[PDB]
């Protein structure tokens, strides 16, 4: 079931048994890298990178053609930020919630959701610290996070 | 012991419903627990509709009806003989009486 939500919904991707590339794909291993590079520099998260490639260029699994996924490709070159984009949107949501609370004070449901957003941030950062992907001194502060968006 | 599976109301998936007022006693009754009764009766009685018909200055005028939406509490819906106390197996019949 969901982490901080009820319901046990089942909506995810299912990779087929085919660990190969369809023959009707004319994009080589280097042409897809240029597509990721030209779009990541335009201000598009890696989550948005695979979407446009899947829906316009017809990509299936870069992990099959290339020995690495999109994450290990942009990091080997140096085009992806340090903190992952997943935690980036977790902090962005809290900024809108904080700004919403500053104008509306008696919205108890919005304040209740604020704790859930921060709870996922600390649980995720706790995994970030033990994986050495974030600095051990990294700490989310609600006062200084407004400029991180 | 639990007398009814629905506890005598139509609250499924909710925690609280809007309470409404009764008619003959003015008691706060929940909306789902109220004894609905849509009364639709003529303005003039059938025993007096003929006197009004011949006194009508027109040729054919249909007399309107009194559309009244009544709400009864459990203690009054039984005293007013709107609902009765049915048998243990008869209570499960949710079909309206003919």
């Amino acid at each position: 079931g969901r982490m901080h939500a009820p319901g046990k919904g089942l909506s995810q991707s299912a990779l087929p048994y085919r660990r190969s590339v369809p023959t009707w794909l004319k994009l080589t291993s280097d042409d897809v890298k240029e597509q990721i590079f030209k779009l990541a520099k335009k201000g598009l998260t890696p989550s948005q990178i695979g979407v446009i490639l899947r829906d316009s260029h017809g990509v299936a699994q870069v992990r099959f053609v290339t020995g690495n996924k999109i994450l290990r490709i942009l990091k080997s070159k140096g085009l992806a930020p340090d903190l992952p984009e997943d935690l980036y949107h977790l902090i962005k949501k809290a900024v809108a919630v904080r700004k919403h609370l500053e104008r509306n004070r008696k919205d108890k449901d919005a304040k209740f959701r604020l704790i859930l957003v921060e709870s996922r941030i600390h649980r995720l950062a706790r995994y970030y610290k033990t994986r050495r992907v974030l600095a051990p001194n990294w700490k989310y502060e609600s006062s200084t996070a407004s400029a991180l968006v | 012991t639990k007398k009814r599976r629905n506890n005598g109301r139509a609250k499924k998936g909710r925690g609280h419903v809007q309470p409404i007022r009764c008619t003959n006693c003015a008691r706060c009754v929940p909306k789902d627990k109220a004894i609905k009764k849509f009364v639709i009766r003529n303005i003039v009685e059938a025993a007096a509709v003929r006197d009004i018909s011949e006194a009508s200055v027109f040729d054919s005028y249909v007399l309107p009806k009194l559309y009244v939406k009544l709400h009864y509490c459990v203690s009054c819906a039984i005293h007013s003989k709107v609902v009765r106390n049915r048998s243990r197996e008869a209570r499960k019949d949710r079909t309206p009486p003919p």
Binding site: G1, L15, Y17, R19 | -
Partner: protein, 129 residues
């Protein structure tokens, strides 16, 4: 959310056996589950199960022969020596004539009679009779 794959495996087998089914589908597969089924199949409690070789946890479809009474797990996997193995036999098996306790010795997954012949104990997984 699972905390055990052998528990949900033997629970699916135990239910499908009592419901009169002939084959049961086990959603997660693992080498501990496969070697557990081999101990039951070697003694004549299940048929020839087929491991659905997927690039995931893997599934197993076991052929039920109805010869099984109940298969269950002992969570947690307690450390059972040879001096106290006689105690678990009176608490999990119906009688001294049939029924086996699946132990995990250092030589691999086996039953309680094989572990006594090999003269070695280990962690207990479950039982079947």
């Amino acid at each position: 959310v699972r905390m055990n794959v052998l528990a949900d495996a033997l629970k699916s087998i135990n239910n499908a056996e009592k419901r009169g089914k002939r084959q049961v589908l086990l959603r997660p597969c693992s080498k501990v589950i496969v070697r557990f089924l081999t101990v039951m199949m070697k003694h004549g409690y299940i048929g020839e199960f087929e491991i659905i070789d997927d690039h995931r946890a893997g599934k197993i479809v076991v052929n039920l022969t109805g010869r099984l009474n109940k298969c269950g797990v002992i969570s947690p996997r307690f450390d059972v020596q040879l001096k106290d193995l006689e105690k678990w036999q009176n608490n999990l098996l119906p009688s001294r004539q049939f029924g086996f306790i699946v132990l995990t010795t250092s030589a691999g997954i086996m039953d309680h009679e094989e572990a006594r012949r090999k003269h070695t104990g280990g962690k207990i997984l479950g039982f079947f009779f």
